[PDB]
Paper text:
From sequence analysis it was proposed that the RdRPs of Birnaviridae possess a non-canonical active site where the polymerase sequence motifs are re-ordered C-A-B, motif C containing ADN in place of the conserved GDD catalytic residues.
Some residual electron density could be observed linking residue 19 to the first residue (E27) of an adjacent polymerase molecule, but it was not sufficiently well-resolved to allow modeling of the intervening residues. Despite being crystallized in the presence of Mn2+ and ATP, no metal ions or nucleotides were observed at the active site. While additional electron density was seen connected to the C-terminus of the molecular replacement search model in three of the four copies of VP1 present in the asymmetric unit only eight additional residues (791–798) could be placed, suggesting that residues 799–845 are not ordered. Models of a VP1 elongation complex based on superposition of the reovirus RdRP elongation complex or of HIV reverse transcriptase in complex with a DNA template require refolding of a small segment of the VP1 C-terminal extension, residues 654–670, in order to accommodate the nascent RNA duplex (not shown). It is possible that the purpose of the C-terminal extension is to rigidify the polymerase during initiation, but that this extension must peel away to allow the growing nucleotide chain to exit the active site.
Residue numbers in the entry: 3 to 19, 27 to 798
The structure:
Amino acid sequence: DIFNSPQNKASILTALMEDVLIPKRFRPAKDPLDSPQAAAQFLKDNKYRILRPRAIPTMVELETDAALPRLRQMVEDGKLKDTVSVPEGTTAFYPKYYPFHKPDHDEVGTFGAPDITLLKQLTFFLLENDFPTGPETLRQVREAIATLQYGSGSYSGQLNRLLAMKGVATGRNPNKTPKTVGYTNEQLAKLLEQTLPINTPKHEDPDLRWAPSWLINYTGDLSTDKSYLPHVTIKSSAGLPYIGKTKGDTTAEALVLADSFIRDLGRAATSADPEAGVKKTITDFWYLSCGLLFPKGERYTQVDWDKKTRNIWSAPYPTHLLLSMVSTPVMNESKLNITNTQTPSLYGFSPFHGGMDRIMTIIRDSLDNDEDLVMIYADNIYILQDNTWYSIDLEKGEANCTPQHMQAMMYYLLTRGWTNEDGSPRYNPTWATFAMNVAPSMVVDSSCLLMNLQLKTYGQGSGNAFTFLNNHLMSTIVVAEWVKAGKPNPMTKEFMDLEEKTGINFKIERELKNLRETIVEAVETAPQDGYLADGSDLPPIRPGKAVELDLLGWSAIYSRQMEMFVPVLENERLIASAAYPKGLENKALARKPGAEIAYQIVRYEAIRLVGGWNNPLLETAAKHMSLDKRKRLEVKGIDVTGFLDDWNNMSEFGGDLEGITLSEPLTNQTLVDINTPLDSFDPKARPQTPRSPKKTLDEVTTAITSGTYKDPKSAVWRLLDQRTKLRVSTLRDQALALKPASSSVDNWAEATEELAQQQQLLMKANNLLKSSLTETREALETIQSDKII
């Protein structure tokens, strides 16, 4: 007996405890900053502000019908918990927040696992198919698996991120308030009328006059039972004072705290001593300004794992609720962007249903007419000039925000949104006080919690209800300054000089040269074969050239079948998402077997839908995998159609492609359906902005340089601007000045004008002039004497 197949004999030591094609799992390094002592020393060494820790009173159980009288019937019907847990204890506690960082040095598991199954399938399919693009697709997917890692970073990554935020806010280019840049609240509002056009909330929506719990209508009758409050993610964190609880566990508690904060603020504002009362309320509710520093799940670079972890500033549920009551009713009625309105705004943009083709038409018309073009989306700016497409991103956007930026946004929302047709306010002095005087210092330049450490937040908390709005306002200032400077080319020093002028850090992320010629090429190289070409259910052998705009992560591809540009996910994103697919993170659906099962198909269909369809190797492998899974289910008689119809609520690409079904496999018709426009497009037929319709951003900028719009014409708006300059002690007098307009009394307009005349008499008193935002921060950071556990 000779010639037996050799087997690897190893030592007993080896037994007791290389493939180039498959990369080994990434094991994060040991984190030296994983202790409060080490983290605090690191921050102290790096001159990052650590606040004197404030404590929260211990929880006390109260009767729900006593705390929330509006919801007595809900308690009586056994539909709402009979007791609420509120921080009203005699003893206090210091809060601690210890987030989970996965994968970590000790645990490299299922979470953040790369799609090795897909990698193997891509390899097998490449061996059987002569796709010209195939070898590069495989190499890129393998490289993304080898260089990236999906996960929640590390304590070191989070701490280093915080340092970078301090650097943006106070380092090379220190932040500047809009006033410092040269804009009054009214001048900014005139710019925002163009860059962020808004409509008023619905006439049936409640005005900003009530305690949150009053906006809940409960009787028992399902046809009439309604909540006029913003919607919340039930499974998301409650934030302070309920660490380790979800919003679902604490809605009654959040209502109690939100009602109390707004009610107490209101009472204090009109009291005998508004300064002492307002400061006391702010100090008592300090925790409403402190976010939990949550590590964001992303496809981080392995080598930079401990250098950068993006954070989500997890806002206290009551604060989130109160802020959302101001923003959401306005924004829900304001899905106005460049594809439907004459505005640079990209708010509510979707590249699907002809959206990308509308952008391409606007780009082509601008190129043909030798016109410059600008588009704004939060911290993203797009400039078309000199036959070049530029993508400009604010450098760590949130860090550039000052409380004054948010106050200017609140001014814009309350003047252009929360207003009646007659010019009377859709708010009372209590809500004007919260919105203008307190709210901006609760989420901007406030604090965050990591472990037992209460740390300073430099700029706005990323993830707060106003993140997009505040970032959009900052980009509006950068764009307005670019227009003022005579539109300098983004590659020049004249453009880069706008960093110091605005106090806003930014960088050129993309420079797409010879745009006109690139577009011609995209049209000419469009294939005659396959999906959206001859309409067959196959990828093209050789795909066409893409116009790599990276417009909110999208590139443009020309379709011969549809005779239009269609979106495809930017290559780098497509490859990263294929390499590290997110799990069923979406909702609390994770334990649902139907959802978990359907997701496996959803994952591969979504990657095809977003642009994989146009990559022959990726399309071949992903089609095979989804079909194989569907076949297994069909044969086995396991039905997951429900989850496949409502797949949007599970896929990271779900929001983008709403109302399409994955119960049937992806075909050419799926691609046709997602790209089908409801209406034909004429850029000239797009309605103008709701406010200053005939004016352009360029005209408003020119008017501002001439000193126009320093002060609003409306007396109501003048009182709201004066509100930003007057100290908290003046709150009772400011409430009196607003009461006639707020109550819509007979001849309120004349009365408001006379009251503003009276208030103007305070405005000679330099002693009465102090930002309520500074007073809020002082009160939030104050450390009053209390006995801890």
